[PDB]
């Protein structure tokens, strides 16, 4: 897993790879690691995939209820505080490592959360197995006061470093841009540099190859 | 209709809680007690009605200490006053456990205030039949308070409740007018004795015992102590001189 977060002049951008693995075997070649807390606050998950999905939806549900109760747009610090206090209570047993980013009435924000409940704040962050490959690129090309397009290029290059160099990462790049005065644009499969080449042979079987013992029609209608 | 006075938390048509006002009648029936704020501390004093010669003198102590710096005195149902002081002692210990510093008097006043007010919110509990005069010395000067059965409390230059509260307040008002610069700890103890002896005229059919306590910064190092021995007798003689 490779997930990154980059701050630019008028917002924040997050990016991720699309490889899900069960040990050394790839389960999903195109999974969504960019989750949504609220319309303008997005989350990137690493570690236990079931834990990252559920903790995002639980806090996201509570954020929606809070937003409707307060009659205000969701804040990143609110989603951050609710995530860290939930993860701390379970003492790291919920294996959710998240990069949370978004825009709100107070501005743009970028945070990273660990499973035990610790939080870090920065302009560029990376988590997962391909974190070191991503951070290497981030430490080399990052500058202060980045433009929108520069931030997309920097985040995408960091994810690519995870794809090529880390075995726990591969396939495609998913990007989500969050600007101060605009709607958040979620770019599913922003880059697809790992398209499977055409097979050397078609393995379509002639009809009647498999031996059948018994055949029946299943009743669906009650 | 009628029956608004039968249950506690019930509002009457004119927006009153009669069960609380009925608890005030129990306080008015009780013994007169006072409190005097001086220039660096507070002085508490209470009447002790001698019902019979069989009562052992200087034994049935009415004035109670909370923590090490707060003194409490009350009028009305004595057992109800003890229940409030027991809660006050629990609340003071809880404050010292968490915040290290001994509980401030305004802080302590609210803790008793919220607890007494809580007993006016339900029909399963009875309102307190006591008005408690309390105070002491904390971080910034001395404080004197008087707490009512409703939960209402204020800061006081001089407090009075019980049987002879009218005579006590009238004598306390004279002290505020004559001493704008501030009365001293020595003078306040002597004066506290005078106030009760004059307030005893409302219950002059029975004999009484005098009980004074004080908490002064220069005299008792900001700790609550009972007035004993020569200083107590000096107060009695001062009151017996001006009664005639």
């Amino acid at each position: 897993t490779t997930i990154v977060g980059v701050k630019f002049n008028n917002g924040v951008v997050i990016a991720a790879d699309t490889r899900s693995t069960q040990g050394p075997i790839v389960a999903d070649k195109n999974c969504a690691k960019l989750h949504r807390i609220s319309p303008k606050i997005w989350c990137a998950g690493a570690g236990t995939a079931a834990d990252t999905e559920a903790v995002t939806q639980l806090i996201g549900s509570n954020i929606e209820l809070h937003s409707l109760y307060t009659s205000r747009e969701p804040r990143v610090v609110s989603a951050l505080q609710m995530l860290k206090q939930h993860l701390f209570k379970y003492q790291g047993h919920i294996g959710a490592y998240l990069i949370v980013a978004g825009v709100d009435p107070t501005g743009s924000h970028l945070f990273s959360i660990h499973a035990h409940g610790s939080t870090d704040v920065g302009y560029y962050l990376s988590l997962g197995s391909g974190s070191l490959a991503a951070m290497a690129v981030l430490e080399s090309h990052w500058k202060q006061d980045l433009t929108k397009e520069e931030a997309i290029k920097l985040a995408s290059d960091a994810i690519q470093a995870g794809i090529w160099n880390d075995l726990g990462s591969g396939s495609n790049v998913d990007v989500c841009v969050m600007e101060i005065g605009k709607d958040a644009e979620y770019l599913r499969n922003y880059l697809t540099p790992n398209v499977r080449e055409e097979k050397q042979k078609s393995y379509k079987f002639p009809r009647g190859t498999t031996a059948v013992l018994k055949e029946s029609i299943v009743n669906i209608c009650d | 209709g009628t029956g608004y006075d039968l249950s506690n938390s019930v509002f009457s048509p004119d927006g009153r809680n009669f069960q609380v006002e009925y608890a005030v009648k129990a306080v008015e029936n009780g013994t007169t007690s006072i409190g005097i704020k001086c220039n660096d501390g507070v002085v508490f004093a209470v009447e002790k009605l001698i019902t019979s010669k069989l009562l052992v003198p200087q034994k049935n102590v009415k004035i109670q200490v909370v923590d090490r710096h707060i003194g409490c005195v009350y009028s009305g149902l004595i057992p109800d006053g003890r229940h409030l002081v027991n809660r006050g002692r629990e609340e003071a210990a809880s404050f010292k456990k968490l915040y290290k510093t001994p509980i401030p008097i305004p802080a302590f006043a609210d803790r008793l205030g919220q607890y007494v007010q809580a007993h006016t919110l339900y029909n399963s509990v009875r309102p307190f039949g006591v008005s408690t005069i309390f105070g002491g010395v904390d971080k910034n000067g001395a404080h004197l308070y008087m707490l009512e059965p409703s939960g209402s409390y204020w800061g006081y230059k001089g407090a009075a409740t019980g049987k002879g509260r009218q005579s006590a307040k009238a004598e306390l008002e004279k002290l505020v007018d004559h001493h704008p610069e501030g009365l001293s700890a020595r003078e306040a103890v002597k004066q506290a004795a005078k106030i009760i002896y004059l307030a005893h005229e409302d219950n002059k059919e029975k004999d009484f015992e005098l009980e004074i306590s004080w908490c002064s910064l220069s005299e008792t190092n900001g700790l609550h102590k009972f007035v004993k021995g020569d200083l107590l007798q000096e107060a009695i003689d001062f009151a017996q001189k001006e009664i005639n």
């Binding site: 639980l58 209820l65 109760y69 958040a184 644009e185 | 809580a118 399963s124």
Partner: protein, 250 residues
Amino acid sequence: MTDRYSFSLTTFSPSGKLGQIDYALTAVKQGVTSLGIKATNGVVIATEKKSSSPLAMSETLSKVSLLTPDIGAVYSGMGPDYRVLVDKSRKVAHTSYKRIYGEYPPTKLLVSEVAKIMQEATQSGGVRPFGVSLLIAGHDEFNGFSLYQVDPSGSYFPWKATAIGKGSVAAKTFLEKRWNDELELEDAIHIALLTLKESVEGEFNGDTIELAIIGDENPDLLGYTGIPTDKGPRFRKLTSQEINDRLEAL
């Protein structure tokens, strides 16, 4: 301390009448008139903003509330009782449905959940029934557009068009004459403004009238772009200007 009211406060009278329900319904009758009309391509719910003071801002008090992005609610009766029900209705949509099925509840089931809460306020110990009737308008994929009325008893009925409050009897009669099964959303809003005018005594404008619709999806109100299946909320509260534009063609 400790709640000693463990017994029912609503009981059956000799005649069979449940007193507290009847008296709660009486409180609804005293309340300001609110109405709902269902069209072919949408549902409209409207009410009068009865301001207690001209110094008070009517914008801060919303009589029409969003429950889900596809479901809205309006009331007649006790304001405070409505506000807490909306809080409970919003929460039950997540706890009993969205955190289970990953999607928002259909109108009929959310109505059933609100009705359950109001039913419990009739049977449970130490409580009184809610002094409100609710009009819930919403949309879901498999049922389409629907309008429901929830009473203090906890009973609910589906409606083509209805009204509750002060002049509910007069408003229902007016709705019966003007409603047809071929009405468009814009037509339904037109009847809504006509029916509400008979109830409103004072000023009749976009600042004194609160109106919301359940219609087409709003991609501009979603807040994000990317997911094709996410097309935006169907609930939309009409602004003061949007109401005033339709009042000129009255």
